[PDB]
Design a protein around this ligand. Structure first.
Ligand SMILES: *[C@@H]1O[C@H](CO[C@H]2O[C@@H](C)[C@@H](O)[C@@H](O)[C@@H]2O)[C@@H](O[C@H]2O[C@H](CO)[C@@H](O[C@@H]3O[C@H](CO[C@H]4O[C@H](CO)[C@@H](O)[C@H](O)[C@@H]4O[C@@H]4O[C@H](CO)[C@@H](O[C@@H]5O[C@H](CO)[C@H](O)[C@H](O)[C@H]5O)[C@H](O)[C@H]4NC(C)=O)[C@@H](O)[C@H](O[C@H]4O[C@H](CO)[C@@H](O)[C@H](O)[C@@H]4O[C@@H]4O[C@H](CO)[C@@H](O)[C@H](O)[C@H]4NC(C)=O)[C@@H]3O)[C@H](O)[C@H]2NC(C)=O)[C@H](O)[C@H]1NC(C)=O
Ligand SMILES: *[C@@H]1O[C@H](CO[C@H]2O[C@@H](C)[C@@H](O)[C@@H](O)[C@@H]2O)[C@@H](O[C@H]2O[C@H](CO)[C@@H](O[C@@H]3O[C@H](CO[C@H]4O[C@H](CO)[C@@H](O)[C@H](O)[C@@H]4O[C@@H]4O[C@H](CO)[C@@H](O[C@@H]5O[C@H](CO)[C@H](O)[C@H](O)[C@H]5O)[C@H](O)[C@H]4NC(C)=O)[C@@H](O)[C@H](O[C@H]4O[C@H](CO)[C@@H](O)[C@H](O)[C@@H]4O[C@@H]4O[C@H](CO)[C@@H](O)[C@H](O)[C@H]4NC(C)=O)[C@@H]3O)[C@H](O)[C@H]2NC(C)=O)[C@H](O)[C@H]1NC(C)=O
Lengths: 434, 213, 434, 213
């Protein structure tokens, strides 16, 4: 028992278009059928009107001889041929049928407009952080500058539909724009994401905007004083913290020192405790134009290894504040490098020299050291790349050894030793031989 | 040839006996037909002739009239009664419908729930800044939005879209964006989106001070 | 017509002390005078009692032969010599005069305690911000850990006295503590300050604590900066200067910009010539405390490749001189990387994933770029080490590709592409396959 | 040698005729003397012997008694009547005063005015955290403080100091601090200082997040 209308969208002022309110659910040919319209927040305005056969065809004022109402009883359809379109014809057009005008269709909305079809822009609305209280972080999405209407805003691909509030679009100087809100629980947002799925039908612009939040953390006070000096604390070499007979010294040196800054007086803190360095003060070295005071304090292996801080408090006359900086460790749960060996490739076998790389991988942290060993002792040439974080979050390093064909082919055996904490007794090593 | 509907809109609570008439320019000897047009959907023939409820229509609904006047009494409102209503002159072409009335339903006061949002990082880079301010779920629609660029000032460039009376919720949830210059925004810090409804004798505010978030 | 008592504060349990209720306002010598006490929230306990002359001297139980009541009629004074002080003697001691005990003095409070005179600590009580409504921000001050009593709390040096509520001190394990509140209007607080003035008489600790509100979060970094900005010109990415469809942009950006430095007006020089950038001026970005104006001017490949300079002249109001800096090339005679491929090692062949490295060596300069290609198109995971200068003076880089055994053994073929100027048509590539 | 004062405390409103007696162990033939001891100050000889008001004493005050009993009627209370009162046996050494009564004045109910304060930034750095909670101006003193570490729990380490019946205000204004571990405090967030007086049938709460600046 139904009739629905077809095609009729945007049209240039004056031009024409034809809509066809299609029916079904009974005998068409025995019925009178009108067309009516309604403009923005307006009343109902009756327009054309044909009849069963096609005899009478009563139209009216605002569309006389400029809009034509056909019919095709045979294959159930009514029509309207909007011709001279005055901008004031913009509306949605229904299609009923007499008896007393009982069954109105859906409606198609024409828009008599000179404007150009302009695709919008999505602007995700994330809250200004604050505190996520009351368990309800309402979100929103902004669609601005689209012409004409309408647009379909759906949340998380229509999955979400608890409490959303899409907003009636508003015309603003030939440009439409509106927004939509979405009341959700606090917890799911940070975690399980929310997207703004929208499409401008008349443009075909399907878009999904993931509402990412900001970082209200106040970490903006990074500066650099050009007047007084600035100290830098450097970690001990991994080999020192590994080889037991070697004593791991931690340094901390100042830079911008003139012909006034006294001995500076260095003082360290191994976990809010203070201690006697080792008179570590080779100090002042007439550099580029300023000096440089060193403080190479040795410390127990196990201390760094267990993970202890290292403050380097210092006090001078010019200093506005007795500055200091720690240097604890690289954190986390230590991973041992798989460490492998790859002899010179096939392609490179006629060259004068060759390259055997030592491939250490997926370890943690970068605190590691590498050496090779031709014959049976410390060699040269070997160079080590710098620890770079691979896919999973691990690291890996290559160590290339250079030698001649005579040396290689003479099966002199070369060895790659790797020192990393996660290693068995803080060490491992593999060997290559022809 | 011309017919007008009484009360452009009517706010009634359930069970309330609401009536609205339609006055016509000439005598139209009982040839009017009230149509019910619920939001986002096609009108429906409610009653025809004098009264005579069309099939599939509640006994609560009732028509009346003769020549220049035509009532439509409804003893008791409902969720099924939220919509626009307008009489349709059917005596002689051209046919002309009333102006239409909007029956808004009452449900006792309910304050808003504002939430101010600072312009996205993507928009700000293209010039321009849209400070949005959603004041959801509230009744009635009688409320005044007042923005404050930094200290205390409205300005122009505010877009205030409401929404229709929700069906189950029965509340308006108007938004109020505010567009302006990129750096004009950058010249200011704290953006206040004040709002004054009836519910709270005091104003409902919410804002922020332009910081890295 | 009055008598007031003197000295008698804290005393170790058992030890002694003498208080002297002093009189005036009449003839002393013709009067009988007692002493009475009252302990914490207790009743009145009569004790000694002398007489006019000094004849009768009726004492009582709790103080017989252990407290002595003297007199000195001549120079108006009564006395008490607390000797064996049992902790249960701690109280305030009055001093009346018979007739029927009409004129009691002020009272001195002794405290028989083994405890040590411990000075307290002031802790200002600022409200947890919130909204300053009702016009009455009540404040408070906390005095904890003081022995013995008492203490004098005064607000804004006794000036304020509208509605304050000082709180009865309470003993808590040999430690006293209490607080005081102060009802004031909202407005004055933020503005006209409020201090907490207190003193522990028996210690002489006069202290004034300012009641600052709860220190909030995001504080303006606003690091201070001197005489204008400094610009830095950065070279284009090697891949841009190599891939022909990509256009090699050379950048140059300023840093120390305040809320004054205008658009700066950038202008480039390609060999003492000047040219139109591409309106390359995304400019000013509110950074740490200062802005940052960019100037990403594109340029022809062959220009850089041939070796042309790039001045970035700029002029502002604050600028003492229209500064500019070029960025020509790396010079030297270009060496092409030998570029090889090494599939996953023997040792690593049972693992979930594997590593095929691309070994590019002895090239020049570091201006080079690398990509892999599984199947036959752009893949993921591959990471590139940074160019490091080998023995002879050349360079070399490793590029690791990560994949699973199924992928590898399935002979899907992977390819490593390398782009370096010294290459044939600025490019080369080798491939690995199982 | 022993004398006891009737009603340890008495709550009367102005104009009320209040009386309190003092019973003695033996016969003390009219040798008692009532002393008035207003807060924070030395006692004052009110009446002596049987009655006979001491000079500088109001006609309202009145003594009576003989041997084992001794009244002290006061037709009409006042501001000048807030204090403790206790008879003093003066027949024969050792002299012994009553237990003392505390005349609290009535003024009709008045709810408290709570205000919770979070431990200062200075105390927290020395270890320890004192959450204070002032419940000022209220009548009567019949109230129960209940702290909540985060969710819902009292705990121990609470210090509840009252204050004496104010003279003009006539209200108690008890405080209630709460000391604890520095990080224990850091392990929790929302601190609730609930309070249940008579006035409001419902409880009076006030609290905070801890994430407040
Ligand atoms: C005049 O004075 C000086 C000196 O004159 C010369 O200066 C050199 C640089 C040339 O210019 C030369 O021409 C001049 O003649 C001059 O330079 C100095 O001032 C600048 C000011 O910025 C200062 O900059 C810092 O540089 C750091 C790098 O310096 C190290 O590394 C380089 C390169 O490898 C090396 O050349 C340096 O010598 C130095 O390396 C030291 O060297 C000592 C010996 O000299 C080694 O000693 C060993 O120590 C170990 C124990 O540690 C054992 O005891 C051994 O036995 C012993 O031999 C050290 O091992 C070795 N250290 C290392 C690590 O190799 C640079 O790191 C630093 O950057 C930090 O700060 C910036 C902010 O400014 C941050 O953004 C950075 O991120 C970084 O901070 C850290 O970052 C990490 C993350 O990356 C974080 O996790 C950390 O938390 C964070 N903080 C900390 C504390 O780590 C900064 O750039 C130079 O270092 C100075 N020069 C020297 C030689 O030190 C002046 O400019 C000039 N005056 C003026 C006005 O211009
Ligand atoms: C507040 O303002 C700023 C901004 O705030 C942030 O700053 C950062 C650094 C953090 O502190 C953060 O917390 C703050 O919020 C702040 O910092 C700035 O001031 C300092 C002042 O010294 C300035 O210092 C210089 O830093 C140079 C390094 O900077 C580059 O590299 C770092 C690390 O990789 C990177 O983080 C930077 O972003 C920057 O990298 C740029 O980034 C852009 C995009 O941001 C890329 O864009 C690409 O460009 C290509 C074309 O080039 C294509 O178009 C791409 O498509 C496009 O995307 C660039 O590619 C990329 N460049 C590179 C190279 O990767 C450092 O180089 C410089 O050192 C020179 O000067 C010293 C003397 O001072 C010399 O001694 C050095 O040797 C060097 O000079 C050159 O040296 C070589 C030899 O080594 C010579 O051969 C050359 O001749 C010689 N001259 C020249 C001209 O080359 C110097 O240290 C920071 O760079 C500023 N921050 C930024 C982001 O730029 C301020 O400190 C703060 N204010 C105050 C008062 O504190």
């Amino acid at each position: 028992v139904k009739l629905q209308e077809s095609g009729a969208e945007l049209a240039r002022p004056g031009a024409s278009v034809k809509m066809s309110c299609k029916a079904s659910g009974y005998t068409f040919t025995t019925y009178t059928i009108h067309w009516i319209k309604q403009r923005p927040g307006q009343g109902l305005e009756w327009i054309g009107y044909i009849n069963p056969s096609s005899v009478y065809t009563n139209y009216n004022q605002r569309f006389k001889d400029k809009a034509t109402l056909t019919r095709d009883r045979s294959s159930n359809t009514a029509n309207i041929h909007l011709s001279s379109l005055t901008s004031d014809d913009s509306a949605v057009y229904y299609c009923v049928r007499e008896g007393e005008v009982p069954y109105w269709g859906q409606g198609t909305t024409v828009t008599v407009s000179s404007a150009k079809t302009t695709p919008p822009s999505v602007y995700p609305l994330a809250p200004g952080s604050a505190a996520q209280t009351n368990s309800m972080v309402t979100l929103g999405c902004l669609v601005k500058g689209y012409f004409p209407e309408p647009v379909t805003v759906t949340w998380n691909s229509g999955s979400l539909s608890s409490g959303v509030h899409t907003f009636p679009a508003v015309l603003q100087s030939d440009l439409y724009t509106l927004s939509s809100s979405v009341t959700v629980p606090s917890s799911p947002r940070p975690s399980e994401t929310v997207t703004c799925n929208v499409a401008h039908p008349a443009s075909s612009t399907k878009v999904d905007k993931k509402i990412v939040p900001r970082d209200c953390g106040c970490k903006p006070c990074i500066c650099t004083v050009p007047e007084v000096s600035s100290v830098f604390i450097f970690p001990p070499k991994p080999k020192d913290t590994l080889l037991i007979t070697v004593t791991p010294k931690v340094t901390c040196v100042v830079v911008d020192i003139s012909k006034d800054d006294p001995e500076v007086q260095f003082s360290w803190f191994v976990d809010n405790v203070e201690v006697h360095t080792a008179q570590t003060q080779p100090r002042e070295e007439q550099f580029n134009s300023t000096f440089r005071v060193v403080s190479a304090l040795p410390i127990m292996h196990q201390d760094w290894l267990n993970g202890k801080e290292f403050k380097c408090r210092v006090n001078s006359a010019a200093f506005p504040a007795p500055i200091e900086k720690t240097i604890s460790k690289t954190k986390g749960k230590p991973r041992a490098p798989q460490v492998y060996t790859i002899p010179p490739p096939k392609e490179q076998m006629a060259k004068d020299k060759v390259s055997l790389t030592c491939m250490i991988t997926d370890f943690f942290p970068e605190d590691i050291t590498v050496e090779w060993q031709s014959d049976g002792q410390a060699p040269e040439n070997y160079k080590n790349t710098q620890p770079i974080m691979d896919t999973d979050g691990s690291y890996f390093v290559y160590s290339k050894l250079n030698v001649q064909k005579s040396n290689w082919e003479a099966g002199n055996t070369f060895t790659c030793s790797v020192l990393h904490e996660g290693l068995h007794n803080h060490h491992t090593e593999k060997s290559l031989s022809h | 040839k011309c017919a007008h509907t009484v009360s452009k809109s009517m706010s009634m609570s359930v069970g309330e006996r609401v009536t609205l008439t339609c006055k016509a320019s000439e005598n139209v000897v009982t040839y009017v037909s009230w149509y019910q047009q619920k939001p986002e959907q096609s009108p429906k023939l409610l009653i025809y002739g004098a009264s005579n409820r069309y099939t599939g229509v509640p006994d609560r609904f009732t028509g009346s009239g003769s020549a220049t006047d035509f009532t439509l009494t409804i003893s008791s409102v409902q969720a099924e009664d939220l919509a626009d209503y307008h009489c349709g002159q059917g005596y002689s072409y051209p046919y002309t419908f009333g102006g239409g009335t909007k029956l808004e339903i009452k449900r006792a006061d309910a304050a808003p729930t504002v939430s101010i949002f600072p312009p996205s990082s993507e928009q700000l880079t293209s010039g321009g800044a849209s400070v949005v301010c959603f004041l959801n779920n509230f009744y009635p629609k009688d409320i005044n939005v007042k923005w404050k660029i930094d200290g205390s000032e409205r300005q122009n460039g505010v877009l205030n879209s409401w929404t229709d009376q929700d069906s189950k919720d029965s509340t308006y949830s108007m938004s109020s964006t505010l567009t302006l210059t990129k750096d004009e925004y950058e010249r200011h810090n704290s953006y206040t989106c004040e709002a004054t409804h009836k519910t709270s004798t005091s104003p409902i505010v919410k804002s922020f001070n332009r910081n890295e978030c």
